[PDB]
Each structure stands twice: as structure tokens, then as C-alpha cells.
Scaffold this active site. Sequence first.
Site, PDB file in Angstrom:
ATOM      1  N   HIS A  37       3.433   7.599   1.658  1.00 21.28           N
ATOM      2  CA  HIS A  37       4.974   7.570   0.601  1.00 21.28           C
ATOM      3  C   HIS A  37       5.196   6.736   0.034  1.00 21.28           C
ATOM      4  O   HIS A  37       6.454   6.025  -0.151  1.00 21.28           O
ATOM      5  CB  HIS A  37       6.051   7.880   2.443  1.00 21.28           C
ATOM      6  N   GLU A  57      -0.633  10.448   6.065  1.00 18.29           N
ATOM      7  CA  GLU A  57      -0.171   9.339   5.547  1.00 18.29           C
ATOM      8  C   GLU A  57      -0.687   8.378   4.537  1.00 18.29           C
ATOM      9  O   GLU A  57      -0.313   7.282   4.327  1.00 18.29           O
ATOM     10  CB  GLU A  57       1.029   8.904   6.251  1.00 18.29           C
ATOM     11  N   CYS A  79       4.826  -1.139   6.521  1.00 15.92           N
ATOM     12  CA  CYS A  79       3.937  -0.668   6.212  1.00 15.92           C
ATOM     13  C   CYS A  79       2.834  -0.771   5.520  1.00 15.92           C
ATOM     14  O   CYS A  79       3.112  -1.830   4.816  1.00 15.92           O
ATOM     15  CB  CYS A  79       4.637   1.043   5.355  1.00 15.92           C
TER      16      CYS A  79
END
Length: 177
Positions: A37, A68, A144
Site C-alpha cells: 500500500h 501486503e 509501516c
Amino acid sequence: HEFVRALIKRNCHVITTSKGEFNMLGIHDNCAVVPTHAECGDSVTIDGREVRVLKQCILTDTNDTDTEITLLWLDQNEKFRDIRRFIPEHQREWSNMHLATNVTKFPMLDVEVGTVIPYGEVNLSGNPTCRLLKYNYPTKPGQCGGVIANTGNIVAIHVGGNGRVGYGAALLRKYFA
């Protein structure tokens, strides 16, 4: 510990996209991992410089569900320290894990997230995401890509959370063969 800090210093870089700043984890040779993402383009900003992406692989399970994890093969002379031998072969529960990243909001962060357990598939922001490991720690936006690890075990990159727990995409050695 010392292991995790050395990992960040040797193999990790700040990647900047339109989605903000992420931690990028080099794995081996010119191959790095970033959260899918982050939406990296054909060239990515690494430590403030444009780096051409030779190839991008968005990893999926055998049912085409996002892990992911995206692999970037970068057009660089540097070779990452090969950390594949510390990446598990299967999903497993881990105790005394840390989250470590290096980013403007969280500079040289290392925090203990505790036990990490295989948790399966969760919809993160409407997108089904498989092979997640979960930890009972209130991870924050901007963490992240952070590495989930401890001495000798490099087990996930951080990819989401809900204010109470964090979800990491499992790093599995077969991804990097």
C-alpha cells in the site's frame, strides 16, 4: 537487540511515496521489501534520492490475495546484507518480538511488541490481506514497513493496525529464493 539495531542501520532505508514515509527492508542483493500500500512507482525515493525500480513483484497467496508485501529489485550497485537465513520458513508464534523502524516521526524506533501470533486473513482498509501475524501493541500510522524481529529472527514487516493491535505481513523465506 543489538541485532535489530544493526539490521536497521545496515539494510533499512526511508522510502517516500505519495502515501508518505515508509521503512524499506533490504533482503539480499538489490532486492528490498516494502508494503504494497505504499504504491511504489517505476522509480522510488530512497533516502531522498530517486532510485529506478528494475522490477516490482506484488506478492500474493495461491488465491491471489494480497500479502501486503511488494518486492522491489532496485537499480543500484550496493548489495544488501543477505538476511534470508534469519527469515522463517513457515508461519509460527514468536515471543519477545520488537518493532523497529527509522522514519521522521519515529526516528530509530525500537519497541517491544511482545508475542506475535499467526492470525490469518484480515480486511485492511477494505482490501483482503492474507498471512498476517498479529501483536497486542498499539502501533501508529507512520510505522509501516517497520521490521518485526528479535535476535536472529526477522519475521514480518508492519502493515496495519486499529489503534489497539498491529498486523505484520509474514516474511517467509520462499518469497526470496
